[PDB]
């Protein structure tokens, strides 16, 4: 007997234009491809100023290259009261700022690379580095492990 509700996972970065949209889109497609239906994906940026903007060109290009849709995905601020079942931050500043913005957070908060065998702890911000391929590789290194963790933790059907 499985839990028959949805669970919500949010990826969170600074701008909600580079890292977390990329992760959101990859995760959504991966769940579709794995025939998993009870996980809903979101993203936020702790510091998004211009709200409602599409992802950075570099993220759109990587997603387009790999035929991953991002229709309707736009920048959204991590709100004073935002909370999700699972919150997956990109770097330490994101963790710190999430906890400062919402000290009442009830969901489980992780860094993306906790689900990865890569030695790195934090996903560098390609707003500066322009290394969108590296970010893509980091998300791929974590994605199925993250899915598996949530399916088991939330007692969901696969």
């Amino acid at each position: 007997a499985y839990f028959q509700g949805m669970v919500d996972v949010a990826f969170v970065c600074l701008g909600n234009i580079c890292r977390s949209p990329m992760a959101e889109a990859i995760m959504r497609q991966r769940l579709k491809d794995r025939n998993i239906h009870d996980i809903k994906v979101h993203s936020r940026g702790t510091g998004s100023w211009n709200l409602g903007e599409p992802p950075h060109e570099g993220t759109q290009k990587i997603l387009n290259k790999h035929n991953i849709p991002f229709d309707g995905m736009i920048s959204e601020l991590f709100e004073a009261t935002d909370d999700f079942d699972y919150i997956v931050a990109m770097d330490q500043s994101n963790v710190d700022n999430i906890k400062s913005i919402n000290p009442n957070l009830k969901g489980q908060l992780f860094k993306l690379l906790e689900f990865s065998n890569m030695e790195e702890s934090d996903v560098p911000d390609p707003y500066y580095t322009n290394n969108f391929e590296g970010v893509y590789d980091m998300v791929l290194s974590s994605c199925d492990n993250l899915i598996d963790y949530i399916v088991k933790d939330a007692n969901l059907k696969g």
Binding site: L14, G15, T46, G47, W49, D96, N97, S100, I101, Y127
Partner: peptide, 7 residues
């Protein structure tokens, strides 16, 4: 692109 919110 700054960490102002939350600091």
């Amino acid at each position: 692109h700054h960490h102002h919110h939350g600091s």
